[PDB]
Design a protein around this ligand. Structure first.
Ligand SMILES: *[C@H]1O[C@H](COP(=O)(O)OP(=O)(O)OC[C@H]2O[C@@H](n3cnc4c(N)ncnc43)[C@H](OP(=O)(O)O)[C@@H]2O)[C@@H](O)[C@H]1O
Ligand SMILES: Cc1cc(NCc2c(C)cccc2C)c2cccc(C(N)=O)c2n1
Length: 241
């Protein structure tokens, strides 16, 4: 008897990857160079090993959050929903802008999966809990919830958010962005949230779910703005001009 979750297990070579990522990020971001990447890995590991993979708390990720403190310029923030690919292409071109995944902690975990088990220091490479079918307080989900919150709370001025214009729900209130990030934007620092609806033929800023988004934001005393992005590759090459 070995317990089986419904989600894929920890990515192969996850320890070696996270550590390699930390080392590489520090090499290219000179302002992080003093960071001890072996301590960063140990803290990451410390959050979830020896714990039941359903009994994880934000507080578990505190030692890692502290070591990975990085308050990027808050007026340069890009949020996204169900359109991670393009959001990242954008910040590769508009290199001063930052997504969560361009921050050290987000850079480390992007596209990865991980979990441990109760009482032992073993990483589970065969299965990890699905957030839907098994339990929502797993290592991955709790990680992303914690860093998202700090990231969205730090934001200031005009905050931008990309949305996928092809989806049935362009703004999906049951998602990290619509349920976590949007409710963490601070009225003191944030003047405006500007949505960028990415087309994949007509004004999608009229959409019912965008109006929902506007309603949410309006109730936080934050101004709202929406812009259609008809030609994706054309927008990429028109940001700097
Ligand atoms: C901070 O977060 C957003 C990016 O997050 P977003 O793309 O809005 O997240 P999605 O809901 O589109 O997908 C995230 C993955 O996690 C699963 N999931 C976990 N918990 C979930 C809840 N409570 N609702 C919905 N989805 C949840 C998703 O699995 P399914 O979509 O259910 O298969 C999905 O794999 C950015 O702005 C960044 O800055
Ligand atoms: C696997 C995963 C899950 C994410 N969010 C899950 C979630 C949701 C959807 C709602 C409420 C709470 C949580 C924790 C997630 C969010 C942002 C980014 C990434 C990324 N970059 O891989 C990312 N990944």
């Amino acid at each position: 008897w070995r317990q089986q979750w419904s989600g894929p297990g920890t990515t192969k070579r996850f320890p070696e990857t996270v550590l390699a990522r930390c080392v590489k990020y520090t090499e290219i971001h000179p302002e992080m160079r003093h960071v001890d990447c072996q301590s960063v890995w140990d803290a990451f590991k410390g959050a979830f090993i020896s714990k039941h993979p359903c009994d994880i708390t934000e507080e578990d990720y505190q030692p890692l959050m502290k070591l990975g403190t990085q308050t990027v310029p808050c007026n340069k923030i890009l949020l996204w929903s169900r359109i991670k690919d393009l959001a990242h292409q954008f910040t590769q071109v508009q290199r001063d802008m930052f997504t969560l995944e361009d921050t050290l902690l987000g850079y480390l975990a992007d596209d990865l999966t991980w979990c441990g088990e109760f009482a032992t220091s073993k990483i589970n490479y065969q299965s990890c809990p699905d957030w839907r079918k098994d339990c929502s307080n797993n290592p991955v989900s709790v990680f992303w919830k914690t860093v998202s919150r700090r990231f969205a709370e730090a934001a200031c001025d005009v905050v931008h958010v990309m949305l996928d214009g092809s989806r049935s729900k362009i703004f999906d209130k049951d998602s990290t962005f619509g349920s976590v990030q949007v409710h963490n934007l601070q009225p003191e620092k944030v003047q405006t949230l500007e949505a960028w609806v990415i087309h994949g033929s007509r004004d999608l800023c009229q959409d019912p779910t965008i109006k929902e988004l506007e309603s949410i934001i309006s109730k936080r005393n934050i101004q709202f703005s929406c812009k259609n992005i008809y030609r994706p590759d054309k927008f990429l090459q028109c940001v700097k001009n």
